Amino acid sequence: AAQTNAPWGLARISSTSPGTSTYYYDESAGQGSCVYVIDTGIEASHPEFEGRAQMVKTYYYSSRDGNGHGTHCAGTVGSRTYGVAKKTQLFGVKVLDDNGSGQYSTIIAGMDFVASDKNNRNCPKGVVASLSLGGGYSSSVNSAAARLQSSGVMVAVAAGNNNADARNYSPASEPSVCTVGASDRYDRRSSFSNYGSVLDIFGPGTDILSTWIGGSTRSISGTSMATPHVAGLAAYLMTLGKTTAASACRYIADTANKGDLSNIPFGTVNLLAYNNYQA
Length: 279
Hints:
Number of strands: 15
Name: Proteinase K
Shape: globular
Keywords: enzyme, complex, anticancer, hydrolase
Entry title: Proteinase K in complex with a "half sandwich"-type Ru(II) coordination compound
CATH architecture: 3-Layer(aba) Sandwich
Largest sheet: 7 strands, parallel
Assembly: monomeric
Structural class: alpha/beta
Number of helices: 6
PDB class: hydrolase
């Protein structure tokens, strides 16, 4: 399949070169996989989700995404126009309030919720969780992310937007989950992206167009935007049978475009998520 005039990040993940405009992908498109978006919620009624999104848990008064961030990330995972895995099922877990903030105890609870809830869902191709959030180092947050991964969920987390070493941020610094940095459309490390030995992979994160609340769309930047590219890519590859939740991060690293990014400090992987699609 081919999507012409796609958002640059979708085109980038199906190309060995920057600057293309078509997103090439297998038509299976993540069908049969499930991605939990642990964030501010998802506006599931957005036409771009085509009935494939639903809220499953909220830690606040409402399940509504009153912010937009979670809807944007979910759109990059799996919306029709803006998504990597255009046929995946999306499940929203609202751990962040409508200002985009949340307490670590609540974020931890949301991770434990997914580890258990997935046992109640039909997700024959496997389960992914996208965590576009983080704060300072916390062993408890890292442990919760490790538990979620251990339970059989492919966990992708944002590296953080501090232009600093991700070792000092959580869940970014948890070694057993997939820690995602951000790149721009010219194959530079995004100026805000964290880096360091704990990064596994980079994905498109600067100027990413996706869904927003009120049935709208907008372009925003962050490692929060790179993370759902990788989560969607994992779901897509799991549906194809190329990998499993336990091995998806290493498979994505194995098959990434290598050495194409600039402004990568020595000791940080130079690996950009790539679907290796061949027509």
